């Protein structure tokens, strides 16, 4: 109707009090009301360079102001003095009839014409330039274009994938002054642990951004059903994470304090962690050439705490049935044993056969991944040269064995138990060689067997026979012992 504004400043104070209380109260209420051991979260900062710490570092009052405003308006109202129906409004009078009568309408039309359409258009153009994976559209376009006119003759190495990554469009936004060749030089300096001198704050940024780029490249390569590029991508990710050039004997060069000029020239037979641990604790230090017990303990604790895998039972499963049937949708079930490079081999027969079988219950066979989703996350990696802090990650990708083409997008698992690695069960050493299975502290039920399940994404063939597959589970932070297995589905009907 014909409203009557507050011309005595007696009604809008109460309305403002209500509007402010309804927003402060819940905030005050909320404020009043409100698993996997990581051994590296401590030793990481002890070996990370200070130039990296500086990079990692550099790159509620609403309640109080609302309360004091409520107090001010309450005192203001308390200082105030105060048939047909007369309608009115609560807003003050000068807000509509004073000298600022056109100010409100011009502010409103401005907020409608400039702030809304311009910001909506900018947000739309930004959210359209991005892919669902998390990379820019130009970067994905470059990756696809480079994978299309890719001669199968050239063998993929780390240098070629770095050359590809240097064409990332997101690096130009970070630094419009640098060129792709500069990015290649920076990444080479990072891998070979070479000092850029002045562009260190750019090298750190590009290395930090390389993660999502390599994941996008891996996804695209698996999409094109190409295996060499995927393997090279995971190996390059390992190389960039650990800041160590890809060599035959690199699992031992990823250690914190080793001198290559001494190690390579001295020994030529120690290639993996196990052959290293075969030697005594003093011979290890004498070979590595560090001769510092206070510092040898650190590298011994690191090299005895990165995870090596080993399968216990690998086979296909169909949820709700017992055998692989023609034109059915099975999934891949893996039983891995996360062990350190120090523990001897535990025979398969010692497993109590209870941890390997799958419970056949409707709540369980409705979604076989709910049981996997209960495992704790993986700890922080030992990446002394990677700028940010990362959690480990395991990339499980499956290919066929008829021709050798990847037949699904790569699955990236993150949940796993490293309980078999804690410093409590250290009596299980390879050097004791006294059948440590028959030990007074050995109990086969204490070793936890993590599980990994990969949905197949493609149905079984309509024919009848054995069809072979290949499952690869490579690490993404260390140079550990990976998985390279073959499995065949015995379609029998």
């Amino acid at each position: 109707t014909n409203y009557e504004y507050d011309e005595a400043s007696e009604t809008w104070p109460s309305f403002i009090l209500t509007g402010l209380l309804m927003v402060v109260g819940p905030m005050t209420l909320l404020q009043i009301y409100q698993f996997n051991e990581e051994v590296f979260k401590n030793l990481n900062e002890e070996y990370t360079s200070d130039e990296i710490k500086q990079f990692r570092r550099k790159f509620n009052i609403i309640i109080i102001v609302g309360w004091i405003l409520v107090a001010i308006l309450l005192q203001r109202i308390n200082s105030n003095d105060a048939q047909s129906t007369s309608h009115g409004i609560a807003l003050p009078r000068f807000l509509v009839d004073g000298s600022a009568s056109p100010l409100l309408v011009v502010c409103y039309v401005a907020l409608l014409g400039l702030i809304l359409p311009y910001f909506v258009s900018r947000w739309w153009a930004r959210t359209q330039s991005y892919t669902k994976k998390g990379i820019h559209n130009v970067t994905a376009s470059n990756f696809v274009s480079n994978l299309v006119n890719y001669k199968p003759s050239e063998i993929v190495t780390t240098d070629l994938i770095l050359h590809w990554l240097s064409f990332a469009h997101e690096f130009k936004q970070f630094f419009p002054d640098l060129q792709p060749t500069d990015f290649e030089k920076l990444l080479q300096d990072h891998i070979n642990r070479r000092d850029s001198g002045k562009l260190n704050n750019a090298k750190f940024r590009i290395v930090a951004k390389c993660h999502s780029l390599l994941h996008g490249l891996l996804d695209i390569a698996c999409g094109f059903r190409n295996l060499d590029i995927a393997l090279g991508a995971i190996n390059t990710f390992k190389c960039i994470v650990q800041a160590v050039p890809l060599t035959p004997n690199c699992q031992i060069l990823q250690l914190p304090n080793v001198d290559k000029e001494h190690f390579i020239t001295k020994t030529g037979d120690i290639h993996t962690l196990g052959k290293l641990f075969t030697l005594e604790d003093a011979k290890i230090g004498e070979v590595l050439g560090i001769k510092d017990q206070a510092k040898l303990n650190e590298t011994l604790r690191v090299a005895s705490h990165i995870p090596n895998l080993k399968i216990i039972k690998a086979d296909f499963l169909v949820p709700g049935e017992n055998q692989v049937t023609p034109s059915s949708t099975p999934y891949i079930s893996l039983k891995v044993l996360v062990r350190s490079a120090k523990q001897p081999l535990i025979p398969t027969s010692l497993i109590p056969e209870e941890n390997l079988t799958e419970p056949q219950d409707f709540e369980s066979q409705r979604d076989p991944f709910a049981m996997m989703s209960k495992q704790p996350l993986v700890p922080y990696s030992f990446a002394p040269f990677f700028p940010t802090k990362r959690r480990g990650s395991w990339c499980c990708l499956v290919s066929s064995q008829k021709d050798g083409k990847i037949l699904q997008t790569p699955i990236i698992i993150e949940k796993l138990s490293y309980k078999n690695l804690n410093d409590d069960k250290d009596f299980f050493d390879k050097r004791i060689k006294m059948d440590l299975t028959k030990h007074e502290k050995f109990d086969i039920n204490d070793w936890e067997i993590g599980t990994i399940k990969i949905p197949l994404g493609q149905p079984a063939p309509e024919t009848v026979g054995d069809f072979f597959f290949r499952v690869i589970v490579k690490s993404t932070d260390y140079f550990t012992t990976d998985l390279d297995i073959t499995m065949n589905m015995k379609v029998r009907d």
Binding site: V105, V109, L112, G113, L116, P117, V120, S121, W124
Partner: protein, 32 residues
Amino acid sequence: RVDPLVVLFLAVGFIFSVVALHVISKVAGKLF
């Protein structure tokens, strides 16, 4: 043929032209 941003632009332009016509007819009486 038509994009969503085209629709938003048409709607906002229509509302803007309506409010402009209103304010013009209002100021016409005050000026003349």
